[PDB]
Write an enzyme that holds these catalytic residues in place. Structure first.
Site, mmCIF file in Angstrom:
data_model
loop_
_atom_site.group_PDB
_atom_site.id
_atom_site.type_symbol
_atom_site.label_atom_id
_atom_site.label_comp_id
_atom_site.label_asym_id
_atom_site.label_seq_id
_atom_site.Cartn_x
_atom_site.Cartn_y
_atom_site.Cartn_z
ATOM 1 N N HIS A 164 25.928 -3.981 8.264
ATOM 2 C CA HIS A 164 26.780 -3.669 7.113
ATOM 3 C C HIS A 164 27.778 -4.821 6.912
ATOM 4 O O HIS A 164 28.031 -5.210 5.787
ATOM 5 C CB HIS A 164 27.497 -2.330 7.322
ATOM 6 C CG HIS A 164 27.886 -1.645 6.051
ATOM 7 N ND1 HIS A 164 26.960 -1.120 5.177
ATOM 8 C CD2 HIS A 164 29.097 -1.393 5.513
ATOM 9 C CE1 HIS A 164 27.587 -0.581 4.146
ATOM 10 N NE2 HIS A 164 28.885 -0.733 4.327
ATOM 11 N N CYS A 225 41.011 -13.201 1.618
ATOM 12 C CA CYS A 225 39.823 -13.963 1.316
ATOM 13 C C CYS A 225 39.001 -13.352 0.196
ATOM 14 O O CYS A 225 38.481 -14.079 -0.655
ATOM 15 C CB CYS A 225 38.940 -14.042 2.550
ATOM 16 S SG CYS A 225 39.737 -14.815 3.949
#
Ligand code: HEC
Ligand code: HEC
Ligand code: HEC
Ligand SMILES: [Zn+2]
Ligand SMILES: [Zn+2]
Ligand SMILES: [Zn+2]
Ligand SMILES: [Zn+2]
EC number: 2.8.5.2
Lengths: 264, 137
Positions: A164, A225
């Site tokens: 994931h 980010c």
């Protein structure tokens, strides 16, 4: 491009060697010839800040973490130390984190272990995952594995979580259509404006950022980010960012835990 | 009197028609290309013709000579959406409003409803193109 240098930290109990350059984990063997700490991409004056504990500004927050570890801050005066004694009780833990807990089978980042004790055992409202109490405590715990090789497990029950996180790592988010890999994999060693791109490793977290004059967790780094791709970002400590922390941690398997690193 | 982002016609990446009908202003092109919240081109590209811009990136080759390598129409299509010339490129599309994963509202980190504002407006693209055409020799 990454500098030729070596990191041996001067400390109160002698030199500790930090592996900052090593062969990648097998899953990255077709991707990188070599994995590197972000230390290698910093200028020498910043690299020097991590070379000894006296000069490392992060150690202020390690020491404050130690005060909080010893403080009777529970509802009945409980402290971390009242159950765990010295913080050396957490030796090795940071090196193998994040992980699927051996008793609950839940994915845990360090913030989850700290808050389990805070809420269930000290009767306190959970600490904010980027609170000072939390960042100092993670700093203290992380130091108890300094010099140990990052060794996060990615198979077995970890595998679906890791997968994931892998998907997130390569998803090109936002109006800018950029993934972690576009910058940290395709462009490590290059300059994006004034920043020298690293491999975006987290073996050095928690991290004192010179910009902010304070500590930063991997969860908080990730928030920024993805936001900065012009995207809807994720919550620090969210399931998806816990999975990302597992995946990104494993990209630096073999590098040493830096303890508390210094970066821009 | 603009062709909207979704109405642009790319042929082998090129866009033959002006996005606005108005001439590009190259001096404004320079401003757009070297301002962080606009083109921010210098984050990835050096521009030797502009020696006073500091910390140019090394992600992609310098822009000097792009006026020789591409026609006006090619340059328009590359600025508006470079992915139509270079498949999967790291260069973001400056005139694109939808088809994103977790589209954001600026740098807020909050969800932005598509269609988004394009990063550059149509005249800004024309202004950047007009400067790129001068980068010869
Ligand atoms: C003060 C805020 C703290 C902090 C920072 C930690 N603890 Fe505890 N802890 C206790 C018990 C019984 C466990 C489970 C042990 C097991 O699973 O075998 C823990 C676990 C932790 C961890 C994770 C350790 C691991 O190896 O999985 C961590 C990081 C941690 N604690 C930190 C017991 C207690 C207490 C007894 C009442 C008290 C008080 C605290 N802990 C306080 C703290
Ligand atoms: C996708 C979600 C990610 C993740 C997980 C990370 N990044 Fe970035 N990043 C970029 C720049 C210019 C920096 C500073 C310079 C550097 O050290 O590389 C960073 C920094 C990081 C770190 C800190 C690494 C350290 O050693 O302290 C981490 C952990 C990290 N990133 C993770 C630039 C970019 C991008 C450019 C547009 C994109 C996209 C990303 N980063 C995406 C991610
Ligand atoms: C700001 C608006 C600009 C402008 C005017 C240009 N760029 Fe980029 N660009 C990037 C990359 C990786 C490439 C190579 C394509 C590939 O092979 O993947 C390019 C290409 C160009 C060109 C064509 C090449 C040439 O110089 O002739 C031109 C004219 C061009 N660009 C102009 C990467 C980036 C960015 C990184 C995220 C950024 C930002 C920009 N480019 C911005 C611009
Ligand atoms: Zn010193
Ligand atoms: Zn334990
Ligand atoms: Zn146990
Ligand atoms: Zn998910």
């Amino acid at each position: 491009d990454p500098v030729e240098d070596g990191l041996v930290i001067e400390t109160d109990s002698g030199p500790v060697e930090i592996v900052t350059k090593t062969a990648p984990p097998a899953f990255l063997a077709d991707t990188f010839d070599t994995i590197y700490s972000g230390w290698h991409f910093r200028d020498d004056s910043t690299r020097d800040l991590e070379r000894d504990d006296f000069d490392n500004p992060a150690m202020v927050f390690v020491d404050r973490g130690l005060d909080k570890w010893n403080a009777a801050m529970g509802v009945n005066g409980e402290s971390c130390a009242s159950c765990h004694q010295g913080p050396e009780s957490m030796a090795g833990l940071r090196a193998v984190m994040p992980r699927v807990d051996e008793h609950t089978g839940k994915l845990m980042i360090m913030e989850d272990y700290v808050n389990a004790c805070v809420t269930e055992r000290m009767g306190l409202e959970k600490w904010g995952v980027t609170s000072d109490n939390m960042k100092d405590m993670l700093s203290l715990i992380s130091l108890q594995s300094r010099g140990m090789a990052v060794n996060v497990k990615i198979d077995g029950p970890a595998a679906p979580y890791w997968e994931h996180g892998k998907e997130i790592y390569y998803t090109r988010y936002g109006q800018l259509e950029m993934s972690c890999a576009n910058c940290h994999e395709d462009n490590a060693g290059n300059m994006i404006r004034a920043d020298h791109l690293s491999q975006g490793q987290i073996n050095g977290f928690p991290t004192y950022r010179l910009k902010d004059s304070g500590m930063v967790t991997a969860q908080h780094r990730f928030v920024g980010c993805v936001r900065d791709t012009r995207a809807e970002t994720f919550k620090a400590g969210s399931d998806d960012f816990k999975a990302l922390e597992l995946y990104v941690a494993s990209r630096g398997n073999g590098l040493s835990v830096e303890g508390v690193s210094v970066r821009h | 009197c603009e062709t909207a982002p979704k109405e642009v016609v790319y042929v082998e990446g090129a866009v033959e028609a002006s996005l606005t009908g108005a001439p590009g202003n190259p001096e404004e092109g320079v401003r757009i290309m070297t301002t962080n919240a606009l083109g921010n081109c210098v984050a990835c590209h050096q521009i030797g013709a502009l020696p006073d811009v500091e910390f140019p990136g090394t992600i992609a080759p310098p822009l000097d000579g792009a006026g020789d390598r591409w026609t006006e129409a090619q340059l328009r299509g590359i600025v508006a959406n470079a992915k139509m010339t270079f498949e999967g490129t790291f260069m973001p599309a400056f005139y694109k409003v939808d088809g994103f994963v977790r589209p954001g509202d600026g740098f807020s980190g909050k969800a932005g409803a598509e269609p988004l504002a394009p990063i550059l407006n149509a005249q800004q693209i024309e202004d950047v193109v007009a400067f790129l055409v001068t980068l010869k020799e």
